Amino acid sequence: STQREYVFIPITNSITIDVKITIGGSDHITNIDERGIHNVLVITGYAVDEKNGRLVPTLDPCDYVKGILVAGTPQQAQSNDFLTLKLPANKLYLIRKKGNISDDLKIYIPYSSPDARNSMKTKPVSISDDTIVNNIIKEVFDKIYNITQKEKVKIEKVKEDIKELFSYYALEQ
Amino acid sequence: STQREYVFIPITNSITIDVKITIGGSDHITNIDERGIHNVLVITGYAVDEKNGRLVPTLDPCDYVKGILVAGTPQQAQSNDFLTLKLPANKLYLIRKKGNISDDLKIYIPYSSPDARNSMKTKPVSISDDTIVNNIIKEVFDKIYNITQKEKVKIEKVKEDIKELFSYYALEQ
Amino acid sequence: FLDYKIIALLHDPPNKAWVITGRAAKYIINQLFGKNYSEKVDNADKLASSIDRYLGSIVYKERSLFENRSIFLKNILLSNIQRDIGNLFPKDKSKLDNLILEYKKLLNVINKTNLILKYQLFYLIYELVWIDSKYENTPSDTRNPTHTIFDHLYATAAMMNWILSLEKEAKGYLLGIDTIGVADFISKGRKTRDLWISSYLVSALLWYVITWFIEEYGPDVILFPSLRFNQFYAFYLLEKLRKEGVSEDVIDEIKELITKYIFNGDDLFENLKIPPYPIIPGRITLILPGLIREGEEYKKVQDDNCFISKVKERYNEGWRKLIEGLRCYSERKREDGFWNLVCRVLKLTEDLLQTTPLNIRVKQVSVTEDEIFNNNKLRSDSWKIYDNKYRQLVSEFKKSKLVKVTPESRLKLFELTKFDKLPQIGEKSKRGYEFCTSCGVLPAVVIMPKEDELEKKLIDLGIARDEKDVRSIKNMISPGERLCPWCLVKRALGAEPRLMRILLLGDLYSVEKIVNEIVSRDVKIEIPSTSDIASIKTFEEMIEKKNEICEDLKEEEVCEKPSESVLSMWQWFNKNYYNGINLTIDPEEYWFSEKRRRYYFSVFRRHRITFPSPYYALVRADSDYLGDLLEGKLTPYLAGIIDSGDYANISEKKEEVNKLLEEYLVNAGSGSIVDYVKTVLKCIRENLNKCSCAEKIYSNEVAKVMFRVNVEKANVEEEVKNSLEYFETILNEGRIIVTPAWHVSISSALNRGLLVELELVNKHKGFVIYAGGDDLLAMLPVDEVLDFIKESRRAFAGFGTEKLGNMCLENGFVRINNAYYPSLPIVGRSYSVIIAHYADPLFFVINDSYNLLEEGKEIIRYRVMYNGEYKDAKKDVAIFRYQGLTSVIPLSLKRPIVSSVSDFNEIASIIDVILELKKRIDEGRISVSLLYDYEKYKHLIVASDEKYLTEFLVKDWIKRNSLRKHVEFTIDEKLYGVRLTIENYPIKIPNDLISNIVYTLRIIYGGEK
Ligand SMILES: Nc1ncnc2c1ncn2[C@@H]1O[C@H](COP(=O)(O)OP(=O)(O)NP(=O)(O)O)[C@@H](O)[C@H]1O
Ligand SMILES: Nc1ncnc2c1ncn2[C@@H]1O[C@H](COP(=O)(O)OP(=O)(O)NP(=O)(O)O)[C@@H](O)[C@H]1O
Ligand SMILES: [Mn+2]
Ligand SMILES: [Mn+2]
Ligand SMILES: [Mn+2]
Ligand SMILES: [Zn+2]
């Protein structure tokens, strides 16, 4: 059908893996056109787990992760360790609203088991250390989006929304 | 740590035996002391699972489940699908908060899967049909909450707020 | 000095309940001077609402005399539906400056020499970025959680203007605008192009005139409609800043911040470059100080005429700007076609166009220092003027309403018509002149040849300067039509609506700047004709099966490529334009055409697909007794029991009106202050009638004084007397006291409703014509009417089976994802639905929808349930009409509408019945005869009053025409004894509900022939 997967943008290079299709059909929700990154899907109450990279259940009502969506299935080595769900593309927290969706989604999401064993007192870990972006903008914005650095010159624009808008939180252990 | 039990509160007639630590320890969070139901937890990004009731993992920010929090463990035949997360008793968005907690909580939460093989759109529903709230105040209340029915002859002050504070988001699927 | 209202606005932040008695000005400012309070913002807090005079005279100024850790949140109207603000609070104290940095994220790009921007650009985004912090919408006074915090922060800034008008020495005015004949102006049209653009004309022409106001005084001088979710103010401010000149990255702080809340669609004010929905009310009020802005300062003159004419001149100046902009455009475009005509006529007539096809009234009442003050304080009967002056305004309005000046009565035609001094294009009329087929009340200047050689016939008349322009002529103008100047203006403005920008900005650009910005950008805009919406499913049956059932139609350019750019305000045109089928066809040319018809009728049969239905559905709504609620009466609470006329000497209804406000007022409190009232209220006739009833029980106020004592005196022989006089002037006369907060809250609640029903309409294959605060207008396919109403009514009261765009429609409130905003369940709302042939003149359909619900609201009583007993209400009906088959569905069957927090399924339950019936008639469960056999059971049913006999009669009528024998669909008992008391009118309405349930389905299943 019309498959995708929410991939977040961290400041670690451990999130260059879970994209297989890279195309899906020919479309992608979170697009790049003359204005940078639009359709940023910020998750509520989830945090990231770069080391063994997933999204963790958290409960500070403000806990966000801010990433993107690309039309793909992550690695096919999942569907028990990755979240799979079908909602009619209306329950979304999709910011920088630039496109429209067909009112249905078939998503595949990284996610881990809760493990009520320790204190997961998360930390604000924002997107700094811009050095990571310059391989992020290759491994994803170039190795997935076959138009960045091939049809525009304002690559510093997309290299700026990822500095002010793109952030996240993490369990960080 | 102090193991907990998060009772999910739909209108379903299937909350019979899922809290197994009736008294057990010394303090249950959700407390009724001559002023109604206080220490009320509400966890967002979720909804009910009326078919074998649980907290369905969704992504919608307007979705939630308004359940209570006590110290318990379900039936000793689980740790397969339930949500077993520990947070340091701080991130709890609690409503009508009178006191704080032990700064660390292990909570066992009914936690299903999306089980996505059909459309899943959110449905907001309330508690109604006063026999409904009257079937649960004998199904669960007398079991966990002994301080009712003997200390409060203002039995309606605790039956009232449920019909205006105890919502839940359904599925109807 | 004015425009410093930021501290008048933010006299205390939404952190109010987070500085009041635990649960954690405490912060005054970091980017302005010090907020002064000698009596300056004192008055702004005290006179803005009743919460400072309802609960005593000092408690609200102390914010600690009846406190409580839990903070309720009540509806302003029916204080029974609760919300709790709990623990979650504005972002942490330790980071309370970060949000201020989030404050300062776009207030530092343009010069700070002027406040006419630095005060109002933040106004509209104040509420926006704050709900991004998800503040959860605290109330203003916790001892009275009836007004949310932001609402009072704006209501105080409202009358701050009058504060400053007394700060000069004295002045202050309440000005009200209202265009004269709207429902008449809208009537003129032929294809719904003219319909929607005449609506948009009313809207934009009234939007032009108050731009000047918000530029001379800044917003929050306006009361109605609230400049909160204005789809027009949004675009206006936005383009103001865009012309100020900032990178799309610099405005991107505001662009998405709007589109996610307002304009929840995709095609928006930046793809049509125009707001796709007209939302301005044809009437708007203003609280105006006596100051005058002409540069560098604000001077005053003591007169009232300084506005009565200075508003009329602006209203007509907007029309002049528009007409000259159309002159420039048609000149710049004669080389196309049909624009040669517009230029030719705007040159053949210029003086008739020198007067706008609308009119307005303007009344403007005054205020002074006398009896509002004595030296520096507020006396007895000082909180008792604002609503007084408001009533004065509305009394002037409804007095002048007795006369009607239609716009044409302004035209100077006498010479132009007595002699052949009138210019005619086409056929110089044999009979001296003709009337335009659109107005029928003006002499037309363009007279199309009806039809004999339409190609040559008008090339035979020099109107067609050559063989080419005939297409662009014959397109926008149907054969045989006749156009007056005023309606050729609208046919032109329907050729493209982008020129309405000249009206939007209140002369912010120059006119040439606008028109020459839009001669560069070149894009086609389409408007759904009745023939389109009468084919929605016909395209869906051809969208799912694109060419599967299309092979011969693959050449008729309907099953072919959408070619250039076509985009519509119609949301269902934004979500099927790229489905491969061009929604730019003219269905009156393929199958709604005559010659190409029988072919298609034998074509669609082999693909087993239906003949389309020649019927749309003109839905319009109305809020019953809205004016009384704004005035502050209880007819909205008792729609039908009491009328306006039963307010001349209200002392007879001292049973109803004296109830139903107590239970609101006496309950509007909480904690302990509630008891403060829960005793003091009835002690008038219940007690010694004077200020000694409460003095006995007053003490439970002074029973909390000494923990951090601040008060100066405890001798309250006044705050018992004053809290008695307050309720005495309002139960001796059982009205409510109106506040700026009242009005602004209601207008805001109307704007949220605007958004939500804008999402409702186009949720179905709808097409808004005018979404208003308390009204609506649309065209829907005859399949999506009931289900629409059933929610739109419910949604109006505040109830969601769904998330609409991103708004949570809870029980009683409309919560924007943390912001619980109050809806209007107590307000009634009637509906009027016309099932119209596509080949019906819109003039008549609009007239007989407006008058249908116009007199239907004022004529039809039905048996209702008040206080448990049986009464006869008069409003909240849902009228239908096919062509002579009228039907009426009530909607509440209770008074007040939803007196309990779970009464929210009493509403529109009957349409649930009709849905469960219609759903099963066609599924082959119930025969078609169910609606032909009721004419055999109707008499017994209406002659019965033993509801189980009636139940069995209905059960028998259901069972005797069942296709199976095993369907058991039963009607509720309460829908049995109600009776539709219509009286003395040549209209035909069955006098019992189930007959109307039958006739509604008669209509709807008939709207498919
Ligand atoms: N921009 C608009 N487009 C369409 N209808 C509108 C618009 N503004 C107001 N209306 C409606 O037009 C109708 C006119 O209401 P009303 O107050 O009776 O004025 P009128 O019918 O125009 N003439 P009058 O009553 O003498 O002022 C109401 O339904 C208004 O809500
Ligand atoms: N005080 C007011 N301020 C602004 N708009 C108003 C006011 N009163 C009415 N309107 C609107 O203008 C029209 C008023 O005429 P109408 O709606 O017939 O009166 P009403 O006061 O709503 N009573 P009702 O006859 O039951 O509808 C409606 O479109 C209202 O929404
Ligand atoms: Mn009018
Ligand atoms: Mn009305
Ligand atoms: Mn009217
Ligand atoms: Zn005309």
Closest CA to C723 of C775, C683, C766, C753: C683
Torsion of CA A84, A89, A92, A94, to 10 degrees: 110
Q: What are phi and psi of C483, to 5 degrees?
A: -120, 130
C neighbours by CB contacts (3+ pairs under 8 Å): A, B
Query: Could C901 and B164 be called an inter-chain contact, meaning their C-beta atoms sit closer than 8 Å?
Result: yes
Distance C848 CA to ligand 3 centre (A): 17
Alpha helix ranges (H) inside C907-946: 909-921, 934-943
d(CA C256, CA C318): 30
A-chain residues near B45 (CB < 8 A): 44-45
Question: Residue C52 corresponds to which tokens in the numbers above?
Answer: 């400072």
Question: Residue C446 corresponds to which tokens in the numbers above?
Answer: 């363009």
d(CA C657, CA C663): 11
d(CA A34, CA A45): 31
Distance of CA C743 to the CA centre of its chain: 14
> Could you tell which of C177, C397, C626, C745 is best to mutate to test the pocket of ligand 2, judged by most ligand atoms within 8 Å of the CB?
C626
First to last CA, chain A: 37
Q: Are C473 and C495 in contact (CB under 8 A)?
A: no
**What residues flank ion ligand 3 with Cβ within 5 A?**
C 182
Closest CA to C260 of B18, B118, A120, A40: A40
Q: In this complex, is the C-beta atom of A61 within 8 Å of any C-beta atom belonging to chain C?
A: yes
Closest approach of A92 to chain B, Cα-based (Å): 6
Closest CA to C280 of C25, C541, C21, C500: C500
Q: Are A82 and A74 in contact (CB under 8 A)?
A: yes
Nearest CB among A90, A95, A157 relative to C260 is that of: A95
C-chain residues near A96 (CB < 8 A): 252, 256
Query: Could B62 and C808 be called an inter-chain contact, meaning their C-beta atoms sit closer than 8 Å?
Result: yes
Question: Residue C399 corresponds to which tokens in the numbers above?
Answer: 């007095």
Nearest CB among B63, B92, B114 relative to A84 is that of: B114
Q: Are C967 and C926 in contact (CB under 8 A)?
A: yes
Torsion of CA C243, C245, C250, C253, to 10 degrees: -20
Distance C186 CA to ligand 1 centre (A): 9
Q: Which residues contact C99 (CB under 8 A, 6 or more apart)?
A: C90, C91, C133
Torsional sign, CA A14, A40, C135, C247: positive
Closest approach of C384 to chain B, Cα-based (Å): 35
* Ligand 1 atom closest to residue C279's alpha carbon, by position in its atom list: 1
Ligand nearest C486 Cα, by number? 6
Closest CA to B13 of B169, B136, B166: B136
Ligand nearest C746 Cα, by number? 2
Nearest CB among C88, C260, C266 relative to A100 is that of: C266
Q: Which residues contact C146 (CB under 8 A, 6 or more apart)?
A: C51, C74, C75, C76, C79, C139, C668
Nearest CB among B95, B122, B128 relative to C803 is that of: B122
Chain A stretch 68-127, residues whose beta carbon is closer than 8 A to a beta carbon of chain C? 90-91, 95-97, 99-100
Beta strands in C305-453 (DSSP E): 360-366, 446-447
d(CA C890, CA C996): 10
Q: Are C889 and C878 in contact (CB under 8 A)?
A: yes
- Which residue carries 């769904």 as its tokens? C802
Query: Could A119 and B104 be called an inter-chain contact, meaning their C-beta atoms sit closer than 8 Å?
Result: yes
Q: Are C223 and C286 in contact (CB under 8 A)?
A: yes
Closest CA to C810 of C797, C794, C822, C799: C799
Return the HEC string of chain A.
Answer: CCECEEEECCCCCCCCCCCCCCCCCCCCCCCECCCCECCEEEEECEEECCCCCCEEECCCCCCEEEEEEECCCCCCCCCCCEEEECCCCCCCCEECCCCCCCCCCEEEEECCCCCCCCCCCCEECCCCCHHHHHHHHHHCCCCCCCCCCCCCCCHHHHHHHHHHCCCEEECCC
Measured by CA distance, the residue closest to atom 10 of ligand 1 is C282
- Which residue carries 């056929």 as its tokens? C427
- Which residue carries 């029309």 as its tokens? C319
d(CA C352, CA C413): 8
| Residue in C with minimal Cα distance to A60 | C88
d(CA C736, CA C79): 14
- Entry resolution in angstroms? 3.1
* Ligand 1 atom closest to residue C182's alpha carbon, by position in its atom list: 22
Alpha helix ranges (H) inside chain B: 131-136, 142-144, 155-165
Query: Could C256 and A61 be called an inter-chain contact, meaning their C-beta atoms sit closer than 8 Å?
Result: no
Measured by CA distance, the residue closest to atom 27 of ligand 2 is C624
Alpha helix ranges (H) inside C669-718: 673-680, 693-697, 699-702
Neighbours of C595 (CB within 10 A): 6
Cβ neighbourhood burial of C337 (10 Å; 0-12, 13-18, 19+) = buried
d(CA C694, CA C353): 67
Name the residue type at position C776. Answer: L
Q: Which residues line ligand 2 at a C-beta cut-off of 6 Å?
A: C 224, 281, 283, 394, 622-627, 630, 773-775, 857, 875
> By what technique were these coordinates determined?
cryo-EM
Alpha helix ranges (H) inside C5-92: 5-9, 40-46, 51-54, 59-62
Q: Are C725 and C739 in contact (CB under 8 A)?
A: no
Angle, in degrees to the nearest 10, between helices C121-132 and C248-259: 60
DSSP β-ladder status, B64-65 and B43-44: antiparallel
What is the SS3 assignment for C800?
Answer: coil
Torsional sign, CA C580, C581, C584, C585: positive
d(CA C940, CA C953): 8
